[PDB]
Design a protein around this nucleic acid. Structure first.
Lengths: 92, 96
DNA sequence: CACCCGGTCACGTGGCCTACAC
DNA sequence: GTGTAGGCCACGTGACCGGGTG
């Protein structure tokens, strides 16, 4: 009876530990995908979050800019294709 | 002496506690901020911490991958671009 | 219906460290 | 030296909510 509560209590503990350990693993995993946070580093959890949050934003900005460049090159290409098209019609 | 030992311990005890609230509260704030930057996890205020981690890691990887593709495309277009310019250049010297 | 179960959370606490002071 | 103040962490421990099962 009293022993039962200790058994429930203890199993709760080891349960919470395991859950907690998974959360740790996830922290280290996230950390390894942030370039600033190196391939190891002893970085506090709050830092890992804030840098991840920032990094995501930084990569977003890069992505939009790359897209702009892509669309820009496509404008130039099609412009050149159009110019080269008019070098065949005008070369009798 | 006596209980002044214990009186000191309670003080460190309380100040340590109130510190941990601030730190935890900040740690909470960082979690919500990260979560809002993950498209899948946006407009979902009730998101577990472990998910926010796993998806962030996942999202970062996909966007890394996407990024690499975009770059490769640029190199492809820029390759074609300069090729078109070069064909067009010596078709100008040979069209008098 | 009530009763647990698996998941999640915040909290109080002490154990470590790093660095800064006596 | 011997502190000691701060920051980070992982632990234990209650409470919460959720979907089943009896």
């Amino acid at each position: 009876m009293a022993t039962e509560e200790n058994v429930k209590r203890r199993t709760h503990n080891v349960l919470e530990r395991q859950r907690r350990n998974e959360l740790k693993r996830s922290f280290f995993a996230l950390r390894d995908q942030i370039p600033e946070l190196e391939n190891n580093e002893k970085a506090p959890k709050v830092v890992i979050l804030k840098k991840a949050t920032a990094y995501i934003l930084s990569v977003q900005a890069e992505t939009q800019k790359l897209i702009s460049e892509i669309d820009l090159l496509r404008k130039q290409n099609e412009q050149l294709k159009h110019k080269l098209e008019q070098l065949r019609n005008s070369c009798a």
